[PDB]
Amino acid sequence: TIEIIAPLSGEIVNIEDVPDVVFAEKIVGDGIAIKPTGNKMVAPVDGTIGKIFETNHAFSIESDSGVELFVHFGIDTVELKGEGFKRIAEEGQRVKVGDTVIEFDLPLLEEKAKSTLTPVVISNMDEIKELIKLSGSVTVGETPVIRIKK
Amino acid sequence: TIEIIAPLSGEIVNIEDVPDVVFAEKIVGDGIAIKPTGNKMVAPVDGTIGKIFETNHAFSIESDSGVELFVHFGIDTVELKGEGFKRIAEEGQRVKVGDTVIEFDLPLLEEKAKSTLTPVVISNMDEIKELIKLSGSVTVGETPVIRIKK
Numbered sequence A, B: 001t002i003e004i005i006a007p008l009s010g011e012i013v014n015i016e017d018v019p020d021v022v023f024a025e026k027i028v029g030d031g032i033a034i035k036p037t038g039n040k041m042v043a044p045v046d047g048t049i050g051k052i053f054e055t056n057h058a059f060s061i062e063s064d065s066g067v068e069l070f071v072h073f074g075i076d077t078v079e080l081k082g083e084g085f086k087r088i089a090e091e092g093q094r095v096k097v098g099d100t101v102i103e104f105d106l107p108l109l110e111e112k113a114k115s116t117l118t119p120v121v122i123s124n125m126d127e128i129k130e131l132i133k134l135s136g137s138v139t140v141g142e143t144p145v146i147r148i149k150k
């Protein structure tokens, strides 16, 4: 049983209500979304950064347990050409839950961005047995957001 | 105007309701208290660790602006002889808001401890002009807890 902890602070939303069919339709995979309230995206699991979008609004990670997660800030955020994001961690770096990955400017983003919702998804679903999504308000690197059986 | 940000997650309580007169009577100084909800104490300001109690349940800090804060986990926590606390940072180390200082075990502490309330206080009050305490639920290294004019 794996425990996925919040990469960022805010309220847990339904992947379904994410104004972007790639998320809403679970093309990319399944998980939850977060309506951000903080200033950073942290590592939800222990493992290794995989990729960090140029723009710095999204990143990949693969835990030691074998889970591949994809955190992606906002919708259409690429349009901001990397404006509001400071890349703290490095591609392929070894991380532990809670290690800061990216730092953002909510206020800015809130205004200049299409949407603030941040999808948190498991990219290797075929390797998934059970996925239990939680609910409520969460805090960075502290609160669990999903329970997996794999 | 300085901004003191939450060292830990939880709800902001009244220093006054802290079951320990040293806090409740403002002997040590003034601030707020937090009813913890997370798993770590982070640096509320940018500056330098000053002291770290042997037991690891409390620590001092002095920001670059000239504020001396004292974060102290729970009441009578020394009684636990350092049980439930992992000292992450080091005495006299340079830190930035959000850098983990100590890691704790709430569950444990919640059970074995007298009280969980954590006073957050400014130790050099004489250097203080104005102190504005905020209220509500806060998240680690994100939410502001106090506004100072000094």
Ligand SMILES: [Zn+2]
Pocket: A057, A058, A072, A076, A077, A078
């Ligand atoms: Zn994108």
Ligand SMILES: [Zn+2]
Pocket: B057, B058, B072, B076, B077, B078
């Ligand atoms: Zn003590």
